[PDB]
Amino acid sequence: RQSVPVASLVAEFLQEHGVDRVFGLQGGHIQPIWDQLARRGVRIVDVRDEGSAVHMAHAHTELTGQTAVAMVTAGPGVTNTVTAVANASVSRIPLLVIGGCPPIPQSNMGPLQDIPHTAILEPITRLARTLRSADQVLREFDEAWARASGDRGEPGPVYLEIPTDVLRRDVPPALQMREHLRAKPKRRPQPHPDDVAAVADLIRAAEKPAIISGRGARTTDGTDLVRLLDASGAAYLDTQESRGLVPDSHPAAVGSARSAVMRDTDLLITVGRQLDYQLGMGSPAVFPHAKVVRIADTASELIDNRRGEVEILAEPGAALAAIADALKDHTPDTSWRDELKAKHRKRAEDYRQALHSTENGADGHIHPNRIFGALDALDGDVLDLGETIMIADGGDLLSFGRLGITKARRYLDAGAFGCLGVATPFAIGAALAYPDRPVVAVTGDGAFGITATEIDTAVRHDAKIVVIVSNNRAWNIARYDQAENYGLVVGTDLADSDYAGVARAFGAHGERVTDPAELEGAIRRALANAPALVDVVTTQDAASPDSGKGLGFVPDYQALTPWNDAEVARRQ
Amino acid sequence: ARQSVPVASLVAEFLQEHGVDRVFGLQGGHIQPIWDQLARRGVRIVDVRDEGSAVHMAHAHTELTGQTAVAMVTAGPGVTNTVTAVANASVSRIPLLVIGGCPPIPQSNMGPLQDIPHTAILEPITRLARTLRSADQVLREFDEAWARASGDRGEPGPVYLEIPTDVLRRDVPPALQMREHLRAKPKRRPQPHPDDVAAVADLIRAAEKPAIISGRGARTTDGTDLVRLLDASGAAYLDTQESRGLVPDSHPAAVGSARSAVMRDTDLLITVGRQLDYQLGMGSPAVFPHAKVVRIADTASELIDNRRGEVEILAEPGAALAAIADALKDHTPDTSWRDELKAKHRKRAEDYRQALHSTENGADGHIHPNRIFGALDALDGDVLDLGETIMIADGGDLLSFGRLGITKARRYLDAGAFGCLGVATPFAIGAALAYPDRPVVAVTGDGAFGITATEIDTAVRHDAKIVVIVSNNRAWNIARYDQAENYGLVVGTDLADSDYAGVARAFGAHGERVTDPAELEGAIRRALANAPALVDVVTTQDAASPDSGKGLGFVPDYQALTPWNDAEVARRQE
Amino acid sequence: RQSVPVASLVAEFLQEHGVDRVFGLQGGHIQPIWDQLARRGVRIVDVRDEGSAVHMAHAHTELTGQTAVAMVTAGPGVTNTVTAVANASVSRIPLLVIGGCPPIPQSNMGPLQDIPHTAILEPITRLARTLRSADQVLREFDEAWARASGDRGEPGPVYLEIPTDVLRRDVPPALQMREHLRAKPKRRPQPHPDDVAAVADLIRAAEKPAIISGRGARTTDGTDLVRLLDASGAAYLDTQESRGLVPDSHPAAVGSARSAVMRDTDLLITVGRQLDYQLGMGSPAVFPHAKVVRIADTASELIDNRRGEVEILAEPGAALAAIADALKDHTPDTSWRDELKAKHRKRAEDYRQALHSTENGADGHIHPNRIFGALDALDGDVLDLGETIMIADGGDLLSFGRLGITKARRYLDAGAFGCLGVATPFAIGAALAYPDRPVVAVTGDGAFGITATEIDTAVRHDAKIVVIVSNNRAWNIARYDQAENYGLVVGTDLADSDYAGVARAFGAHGERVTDPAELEGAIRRALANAPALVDVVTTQDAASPDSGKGLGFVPDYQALTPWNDAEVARRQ
Ligand SMILES: CC(C)(O)C(=O)SCCNC(=O)CCNC(=O)[C@H](O)C(C)(C)COP(=O)(O)OP(=O)(O)OC[C@H]1O[C@@H](n2cnc3c(N)ncnc32)[C@H](O)[C@@H]1OP(=O)(O)O
Ligand SMILES: CC(C)(O)C(=O)SCCNC(=O)CCNC(=O)[C@H](O)C(C)(C)COP(=O)(O)OP(=O)(O)OC[C@H]1O[C@@H](n2cnc3c(N)ncnc32)[C@H](O)[C@@H]1OP(=O)(O)O
Ligand SMILES: CC(C)(O)C(=O)SCCNC(=O)CCNC(=O)[C@H](O)C(C)(C)COP(=O)(O)OP(=O)(O)OC[C@H]1O[C@@H](n2cnc3c(N)ncnc32)[C@H](O)[C@@H]1OP(=O)(O)O
Ligand SMILES: CC(C)(O)C(=O)SCCNC(=O)CCNC(=O)[C@H](O)C(C)(C)COP(=O)(O)OP(=O)(O)OC[C@H]1O[C@@H](n2cnc3c(N)ncnc32)[C@H](O)[C@@H]1OP(=O)(O)O
Ligand SMILES: Cc1ncc(Cc2csc(CCOP(=O)(O)OP(=O)(O)O)c2C)c(N)n1
Ligand SMILES: Cc1ncc(Cc2csc(CCOP(=O)(O)OP(=O)(O)O)c2C)c(N)n1
Numbered sequence A, C: 001r002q003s004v005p006v007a008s009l010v011a012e013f014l015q016e017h018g019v020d021r022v023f024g025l026q027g028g029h030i031q032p033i034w035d036q037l038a039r040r041g042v043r044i045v046d047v048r049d050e051g052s053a054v055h056m057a058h059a060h061t062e063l064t065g066q067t068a069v070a071m072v073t074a075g076p077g078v079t080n081t082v083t084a085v086a087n088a089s090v091s092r093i094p095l096l097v098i099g100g101c102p103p104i105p106q107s108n109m110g111p112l113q114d115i116p117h118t119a120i121l122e123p124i125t126r127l128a129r130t131l132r133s134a135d136q137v138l139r140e141f142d143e144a145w146a147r148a149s150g151d152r153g154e155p156g157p158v159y160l161e162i163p164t165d166v167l168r169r170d171v172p173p174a175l176q177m178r179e180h181l182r183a184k185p186k187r188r189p190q191p192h193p194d195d196v197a198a199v200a201d202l203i204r205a206a207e208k209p210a211i212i213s214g215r216g217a218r219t220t221d222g223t224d225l226v227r228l229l230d231a232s233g234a235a236y237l238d239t240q241e242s243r244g245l246v247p248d249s250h251p252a253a254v255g256s257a258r259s260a261v262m263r264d265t266d267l268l269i270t271v272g273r274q275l276d277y278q279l280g281m282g283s284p285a286v287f288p289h290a291k292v293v294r295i296a297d298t299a300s301e302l303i304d305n306r307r308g309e310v311e312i313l314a315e316p317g318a319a320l321a322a323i324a325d326a327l328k329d330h331t332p333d334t335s336w337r338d339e340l341k342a343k344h345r346k347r348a349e350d351y352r353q354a355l356h357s358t359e360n361g362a363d364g365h366i367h368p369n370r371i372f373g374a375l376d377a378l379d380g381d382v383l384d385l386g387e388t389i390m391i392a393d394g395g396d397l398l399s400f401g402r403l404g405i406t407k408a409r410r411y412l413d414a415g416a417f418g419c420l421g422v423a424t425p426f427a428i429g430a431a432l433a434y435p436d437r438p439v440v441a442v443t444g445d446g447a448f449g450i451t452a453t454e455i456d457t458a459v460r461h462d463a464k465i466v467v468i469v470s471n472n473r474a475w476n477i478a479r480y481d482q483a484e485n486y487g488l489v490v491g492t493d494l495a496d497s498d499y500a501g502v503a504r505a506f507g508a509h510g511e512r513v514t515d516p517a518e519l520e521g522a523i524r525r526a527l528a529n530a531p532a533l534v535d536v537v538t539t540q541d542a543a544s545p546d547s548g549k550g551l552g553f554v555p556d557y558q559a560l561t562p563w564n565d566a567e568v569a570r571r572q
Numbered sequence B: 001a002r003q004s005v006p007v008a009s010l011v012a013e014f015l016q017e018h019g020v021d022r023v024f025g026l027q028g029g030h031i032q033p034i035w036d037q038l039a040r041r042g043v044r045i046v047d048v049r050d051e052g053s054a055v056h057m058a059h060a061h062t063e064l065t066g067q068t069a070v071a072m073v074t075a076g077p078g079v080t081n082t083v084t085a086v087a088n089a090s091v092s093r094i095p096l097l098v099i100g101g102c103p104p105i106p107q108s109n110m111g112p113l114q115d116i117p118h119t120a121i122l123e124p125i126t127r128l129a130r131t132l133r134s135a136d137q138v139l140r141e142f143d144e145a146w147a148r149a150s151g152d153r154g155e156p157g158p159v160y161l162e163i164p165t166d167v168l169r170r171d172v173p174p175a176l177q178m179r180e181h182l183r184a185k186p187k188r189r190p191q192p193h194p195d196d197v198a199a200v201a202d203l204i205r206a207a208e209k210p211a212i213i214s215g216r217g218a219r220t221t222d223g224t225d226l227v228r229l230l231d232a233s234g235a236a237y238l239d240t241q242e243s244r245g246l247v248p249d250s251h252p253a254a255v256g257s258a259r260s261a262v263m264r265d266t267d268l269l270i271t272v273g274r275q276l277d278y279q280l281g282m283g284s285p286a287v288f289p290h291a292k293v294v295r296i297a298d299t300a301s302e303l304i305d306n307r308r309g310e311v312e313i314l315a316e317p318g319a320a321l322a323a324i325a326d327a328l329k330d331h332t333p334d335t336s337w338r339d340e341l342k343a344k345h346r347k348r349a350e351d352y353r354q355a356l357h358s359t360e361n362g363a364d365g366h367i368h369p370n371r372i373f374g375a376l377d378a379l380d381g382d383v384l385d386l387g388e389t390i391m392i393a394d395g396g397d398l399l400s401f402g403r404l405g406i407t408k409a410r411r412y413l414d415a416g417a418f419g420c421l422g423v424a425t426p427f428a429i430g431a432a433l434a435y436p437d438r439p440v441v442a443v444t445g446d447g448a449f450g451i452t453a454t455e456i457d458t459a460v461r462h463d464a465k466i467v468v469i470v471s472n473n474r475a476w477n478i479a480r481y482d483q484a485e486n487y488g489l490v491v492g493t494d495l496a497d498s499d500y501a502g503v504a505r506a507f508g509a510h511g512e513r514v515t516d517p518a519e520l521e522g523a524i525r526r527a528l529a530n531a532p533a534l535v536d537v538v539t540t541q542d543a544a545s546p547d548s549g550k551g552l553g554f555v556p557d558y559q560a561l562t563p564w565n566d567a568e569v570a571r572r573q574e
C-alpha cells in the first residue's frame, strides 16, 4: 500500500466491491472520484438528469443482485435524485448514492451548493452521512454498503458525501485495511426447525393454502418456492416485484384468479412480500378466511399490518426448502387450486388471444392492448419474450401492461411508489446489464415526458432498448377519474406530440403507428435498430382495471373502491 | 367476545397481554386515561420523582429480565425529562417502550399546553418515534413498535409512542381489535449457516491464542453455550461491563486481570454480541496488533462497526456458540497461552482483592473508596450472598474502582458506554422490584448521586430494598484530577461535605455516615438489615482510579485513553 | 492579536459579549473552554444537574435582558438540558448552550458520548451546529448569538458544540475579527405611521378596548404602555410572563376581572403576547366581541391563531409611544374600564385580606394561601415585596400563587410549557443577578423533588434564596383530577418528606411549619438566614382555580372546561 488521496481509495473500494459501472452526471465536487473511476477502468454511464442515474442503479441491483452506484454533484445534483432514492427506499433496493459537497472550511458560509443533503435524504435512506475524516472514509463506505443490504435496518439506498478538501487529502497506507476494501457475501440467516415444523402443521391443516411472493422471493431462483408449492398444493400469486419465479404452466400459477385466491384462501403465506396497499393491507376485509404466515429475510416483510401465526426470519430459499422437507409424507389436497387453475386457463388464454384483435376506441385510435398483442405475436419470430426484460410505466398503460405482459425473463415497473418516468432509465440499466437481448419498455406519454431526454443516454452508450409509447394525448387515468367522479376534465390533456421525432432528434430509430395492423412491423424494425422508439397513437376510450376500480379516487381505507367497500363493512 | 372500548383501555390490555406487570412513570393529565386503565387491570404503577428515572428503571428491568419494560410520561417536560435515559438505552441497545402524552389533534400547532415536537427530538435516539392519530390502528402500531424495540427493521433499543388525548378517549369497534396484535410474541431465533460455523471452527483450529470478548448479546444467554465453546476452543475469555456473570470466576478461560495481555497477543478475537467501540479500542490494530477478527451477534450493530470479521455470524448467539462447539468435537485445543495468563491472573486478582480490606487513607485522612469493596467482600457469606446480589456502580473514580472491586455479583449494571451519571439509584430500584428476595447494592460517586438522589423517596414509597453507598469525596474527582494534572487549575469541580445520610433519612430511608474505614462492614451490615438504606462514606480526594491515570478525562484525538491513543498515533505514522 | 486555541477565543467572545458568568457542569469535552473562562475571570456557576444550569441562564436573560450561557459536556451532559432548552424555546428566551462532543477523527465509531446532539435539539432551538472549522468558530458564535435574539427566526435558545480536537486547534491572528468578538446592540425596527394611525382609528371607534401584555411588552419598562393606556382608556391585563409593568393602582389594572375583560372587550390589543392556550387561542369563543390588533417585535406574537386588523412589527415601546402620540386630542370613554376597576378593587382586596385567615383543610393542614398571607404581612417589615423577585412552581400551588403573588419587582414561574422544577434553579439565577435582596420561590413538593439538590448549588455559591414548599404529600392537582373525573387515586401520592432536613443536609437553613400562625416567623428567619427553606405542611383539601376549571383533564379544543364548552358551542 502507498499514501493515496481519498478519491483514489473510493474508486478502489467500489471496484473491489464488484462495481464495474457508475451512473451519474458530472460536477466539480465529484470530479476527483469521477477521474479515479475512469483511471481504474470503471465504466462511467453519464446521464441527462441525475434522477435517471439512480433509476439505472435501482434496475441494475433489482435484476443482478449486485449493489449499484450513482454519483452526483452538490446541490441540485443531489436534490435531483430524491424521487429515485424514495423509489428505491419504498422497493427496498440496495444502492449507493455518492454526493459532492462543499469543502469543510466554508461550512454554513453560503459556498456554492451548501444545502443539507443528509437531512433531506435521512428520511428515505438507510444511512446519509458527510465523511469528514480522510482516514475513516474506507471504513464508512464498507459499513454503508452493508447497511444498504439491510444491516441495522432493511435493504435500500444509502447516501455518502465527501467534502472536496477531504477528497483531496492523502490516507497513509497503514489505515487502508483490506477488510474494508474487499467484497462481502450476502447474509444467510437460517430458519429454526420449530418454526419450520409449525408452518408445515398449518399447511397440513389448511384446505386452501395460497402463497403470495414479493421482493425477497425474487432474490431466489424460484426452485425452492416451486418445491414448496408442489409439497403444499398451494395456489400461487406473484406481484409486480416478483414476476418470473414459477412457470406459467405450473398447476399453482393462477395469475387471472387474484380476487378468488384472496377471497377464499384459509392460509396466506407471504414470501419476502409486504402486506401494503397492493395486497389490501392484508386486511381481513380482503382475506376474510386467511390465517397468516410470513417468511422473509427482513422484518420489513414480517410485521407490517398483519402478524404471522408463525414468522420465519431467514434467507427465503432455505426457509421454503426446509418447509418442503417438513411436508415429507403429506398428500396435499389440490382440489381448490385445480378448480382455480381450470378457470385461469380459460380466462388467461381468452384474454391473451383477444389482445391481437382489440377494437380501436370511439375516437378511432389504437387500444393499447394491441401493443401487447403485437409483442405476443413476435414471440419466437424476432424475439424470445422468455429471455426479454420487460418494463411498464404510466397510468392506464401500466394497468394494461400488468395483464398484457405474461412472458418476460424479468419485469420492472413504476413500483409500489407509482414512480412515473422509470421506463427509459430502467431500460438503459437493464440493457447495459444484459447486452445480448433488446430490452422492451412500454410507457404512457405522460410518464415518458419526465425522462424522454434519456433517449440521448441510450444512444450515446449504445443501450439496445425499444421504447413503445401509448400516445393517448393525455394523463388518461387522471382524465377518466376527472370525468367520472367530478364531471370536469381540466389540466389532464397533453398534445399529439411526435415522440418518434424526439427519439430521432437524439440519434435513435423512430417510427409512429396509427394503424394497429402496423404494430408488428414497427416493433420488428425497432428491435432490429435499437435503440429505438415506437410512438403509438392510442385511444382515450379504454378504461384499465386500475381506472375501473377507483385507484385515481384515493378512498379512505384502501387503494381501490371494492377493497374500500369491504373495509367499510368490516369497520361496521 | 370483544366489545367497543376506548383506545386507553386497549393500550392497557395490549401491555398486560405482552407480559407487562409494571409501568414506571410520573402522572400527567395527557396520560391519565392510560394510567387509570393500567391500575384498573392490576398493572403495578411505579411512580417516580423525575421521569428520567422511570426510563432508567425500565432499562434496568429489561437488561436484567429480558422482558421489554415500559415508562409512561406526560406531554412537554414529562417527555423531555426522558431524553438522557432514552439516549442511554439507545447506546446500550436495550428494548423499551416510552409512552408519551401529547395535545389533542384539533389544537395541533396552535400553542396548546405542551405542544413541542416530541417525535423529532427523540427520532435520532429511538428505533421508532410516532404520534398515533387513528384510534383503530393504535393496537397495530403498539405491536409493530414492540417488535422494533426488539430490533426488527433496526436494532434493539427504545421506541416512543404518543397518542393525542382525544384519540385516547375514542372508542374502537371490536372487529378492529385483532388478537394477533394483543398477544405476546416470542423473540426471533435466526440460526447460523453451517458453512460459517465450519469456517469459524477452522480459524479456531489454526489460532494459537484465540480470545473471546463478550457483550450485550452474549448476556442475553445463560452463558452455558459460551462455556461449551470456551472448553472446545481453549480461548481466553474477557467480558465487558454489559456482559458480567456468564463464566464462573474459576473457569480456566476467565482472565479478567489480564485485559491488556489478552488484547496485545490474541491472534483471533471473537466478539460475541459486542461492539468494538471505544471500550475495546475501536477494535484498532493499534490495540489488537496480532488479531484476526470473527464477529457473532443477532444484530449487525455488533458485526460491522469499525472491524469486519473474516467470518460474521448473524444468529441467536447461543445457537452459534453451540454450533461452533459441536464442530470442534474432536479438536484438542492448545491451551498453554490461556493457562499461563490464568496462572498470573489468579495471583494478580487474589492479591488485588485481599489488599481492598486494608487500603490506607489518602493524605487528606479520608477513606480510600476501595475499602467499600473490601467491606462488601468481607460480608460475603456472612450477611449477604454476593453471588446472588445485583451490584450497580456509578460515578467517575468510584466507577473505575468499582470495575475492579466488584468481582462477585449475580448481575452488574453501571453508567454504560454512554457514561450516564445518575443511573445508580433508579437502576437499584428497578433491580430490587424485579428481584425482591435479593440484595441490591449500588455504589456511587457523590457527583453522580446528586442527579437522582430524590429517587430515595421512590425506593421508600415502593419498598425497594436497596442499599446505596456514596463515595463522598466532596468532588467530581476524576474531573478535579484532570484539571490539576493537564491544566494546572481546579475550578467548578469541588462539591461540599453534604449529609447524604440526612437526605436519605429526610425521605424515610435508613441513613448513616462513615468516616472510619473500620466502621464500614458494620454500617453496610446495618444498611442491609434496614433497606432501603444509604451509607454516606467520607472518602479521599487523594486516589487516582485506573480511568483517571489513563487520561479518560482528557479526551484524546483517536482513542478514549492515552495509552491506546499513543498506540494509534504510532500506527498512523507507518 | 496572536495565534490562540479555539477554546481561548470562545472564552474571549463570551466575555466581550457581556457574559460575566457561565452556568454549567464540568466534563472533559468542555474542560478546555471551562479552563479559559476561569483564566479570564468569568464566574463559573457549577450545578448538580445540567438542566438546572440552562434554567439559571433562562432566568438571568428573562430578568436582565442579557443573553446568558450554559456549558455542558457531551452525551448525558447535553441530553440533561433538553427540558430546560424546550422551556426557553416555548418562552422565546435568548440563551446559548455550549455542548462538548467527540473529536472529529472518531465520528460515528462509538467514541465516548457520540450521539446526535444537534438532531435532538434542532426542533427546539433557533440553531444547533457542530463547529468543525477552527478559523470560523468566532464567526459561528456571533451569528448564533444574533439568532438567539431572533434574527432569521424568533428569540430563543441556540446550541453550539466544538469537537475536542477543534477546541485545541490554534486560530491565526488575521482570522480573529473584532466585528465577531464585540457586543452588538438589540435591533429596533420602527412602526410605519400608517399602521400607527390605523390602530389609533380602531381605538377611537372602540367602546371597550383591552390591552393584554406578554414577553415583548416585558422587555420594556412599562412607561410607553402606561402612556397608551392613559391615551386609550383601555382595560389592562398582563400574563405570567409580563407582570410588573403597570402600577396596581392604575385605573386600567383590573387583574381580578380576567373573564369579564375577555368576554366584553370590542378591541383586543396584544403587546408582545401569543394567543396560545393561556388566552383561549384568541378564539371568538373566548373573545366574542373583539376586533384584534397585534403589536410585537416578532411575528411569533403577530400571526398565531388570530390575525390583526392591523399588525405592527416593531420594537413594542416605540409602537406604544407612537399610538399614544396619534391619540393626541382623543377623549377616551373610560366608563367600562372604571366599572371593572370598582369591582376589581373589592374583589382583589377581599381576596388579599382573606389570605391571612384561610382555614386549614378537612385534613387539619395549612391552606397554601396562608403562605401568601404571611409574605403579604411581612411586606414593609422584613422585606420589600416591590423590590423582590418572586417565583412560583407546582400544580395547585402554582395556580394559588398566580392570585397570591400581587406585589413583586419581577415574577417567574413554570411558563406556558408547565415546566415543573424551575423554582430552585430560577431562584439561584435571579439571586446571583440581583445580589441585594433575597429572592423568594414558592413551590409544590412534587415540582421541588425534580431540582431539590440545587439547594447545594445555592449554598456553595451563596445565592440568597428562600424556598417555601407547599408540602401536601401529593401531586395534588393530579390527585384531584383522578378523584373527580375517574373515581380512582393511584400513583399521585407522595410522602410527608422532611424537605427542611434535605435543605439542612446541603448546608442551608431549614424549618418545618405545621401551624399557620408560625408562617410569618419562619419566613422572617428564612429571609435573615438565606439560603433557606421553609417546609410547610399543607392540606390536600384545597382546589385551585386551575383544578376547578379542568386543566388536569385536557379537553379537546381549549386548556380549560369553561373555554372548551364555549368552543363546542361556537363549533355548532
Ligand atoms: C462547480 C460546478 C461546475 O460543478 C457547478 O455546479 S457551477 C454552477 C453553475 N454556475 C454558476 O452558478 C455560476 C457561479 N458563479 C458565479 O455566480 C460567479 O462566478 C461569481 C459571482 C462567483 C463571480 O462573478 P463576478 O463577480 O466575476 O461577475 P461577472 O458578472 O461574471 O463578471 C466577470 C468579469 O467581467 C467583467 N464585466 C462585467 N460586465 C461586463 C461588461 N458589460 N463588459 C465587460 N466586462 C464586463 C467584470 O467586471 C469581471 O471582470 P473583472 O472586474 O473581474 O476583471
Ligand atoms: C392515485 C394516482 C392516480 O394519482 C397515482 O399516483 S396511481 C400511480 C400509478 N399506478 C400504480 O402505481 C399502480 C398502483 N396499483 C396497483 O398496483 C394495483 O391497482 C393493485 C396492486 C393495488 C391491485 O392489482 P390487482 O391485484 O388487481 O392485480 P392486477 O395484476 O392488476 O390484476 C387485475 C385483474 O386482472 C386479472 N388478471 C391478471 N392477469 C390476467 C390475465 N393474464 N388474464 C386475465 N385476467 C388477468 C386479475 O385476476 C384481476 O382480476 P380479478 O381477480 O380481480 O377479477
Ligand atoms: C470524559 C468524562 C470524564 O467527561 C466522562 O464523561 S467519563 C464517563 C464516566 N466514565 C465511564 O463511563 C467509564 C468509561 N471508560 C471505560 O469504560 C473504561 O475506561 C474502558 C472500557 C475504556 C477501559 O477499561 P479496561 O479495559 O481498562 O477495563 P477495567 O475493567 O477498568 O480494567 C482496568 C485494569 O485493571 C485490571 N483488572 C481488572 N480486574 C482486576 C482484578 N480483579 N484484579 C486486578 N486487576 C484487575 C485489568 O486487567 C486492567 O489492567 P491492565 O491489564 O490494563 O493492566
Ligand atoms: C395538564 C397537567 C395537569 O398535566 C399539566 O401539566 S398542568 C402544568 C402546570 N400548570 C400550568 O402550567 C398552568 C397552566 N394554566 C394556566 O396558565 C392558566 O390556567 C390559564 C393561563 C390557562 C388561565 O388563567 P386565568 O386567565 O384564569 O388567570 P389566573 O391568573 O389564573 O386567574 C384565575 C381567576 O382569578 C382571578 N384573579 C386574578 N387575580 C386575582 C386577585 N388578586 N384577586 C381575586 N381574583 C383574582 C381572575 O380574574 C380569574 O377569575 P375570573 O375572571 O375568571 O373569574
Ligand atoms: C411524478 C408523478 N406525477 C403524478 C403522478 C400521478 C399519476 C399516476 S398515473 C397518471 C397518468 C399517467 O399518464 P400516462 O400518459 O403516463 O398513462 P395513461 O394513463 O395510459 O395516459 C398520473 C398523473 C405520479 N404517480 N407520478
Ligand atoms: C451527566 C453528566 N455530567 C457530566 C459528566 C462528566 C463526568 C464523568 S465522571 C465525572 C465526575 C463524577 O464525580 P463522582 O462524584 O460521581 O465520582 P468521583 O470521580 O469518584 O468523585 C464527570 C463530571 C457525565 N459523564 N455525565
Ligand SMILES: Cc1ncc(Cc2csc(CCOP(=O)(O)OP(=O)(O)O)c2C)c(N)n1
Residues within 6 Å of the ligand: B026, B027, B028, B029, B074, B077, B078, B081, C393, C394, C395, C396, C397, C398, C418, C419, C420, C443, C444, C445, C446, C447, C448, C470, C472, C474, C475, C476, C477, C478
Ligand atoms: C416534569 C413534569 N411532569 C409532570 C407534569 C404534570 C403536572 C402538572 S402539575 C402536577 C402536580 C404538581 O404537584 P406539586 O406538588 O408540585 O403541586 P400541588 O398540585 O400543589 O401538589 C403534575 C404532575 C409536568 N407538568 N411536568
Ligand SMILES: [Mg+2]
Residues within 6 Å of the ligand: A049, A051, A080, A083
Ligand atoms: Mg427531477
Ligand SMILES: [Mg+2]
Residues within 6 Å of the ligand: A444, A445, A446, A470, A471, A472, A473, A474, A475, A476
Ligand atoms: Mg397517456
Ligand SMILES: [Mg+2]
Residues within 6 Å of the ligand: B445, B446, B447, B471, B472, B473, B474, B475, B476, B477
Ligand atoms: Mg465524587
Ligand SMILES: [Mg+2]
Residues within 6 Å of the ligand: B052, B081, C049, C051, C080, C083
Ligand atoms: Mg433531567
Ligand SMILES: [Mg+2]
Residues within 6 Å of the ligand: C444, C445, C446, C470, C471, C472, C473, C474, C475, C476
Ligand atoms: Mg404537592
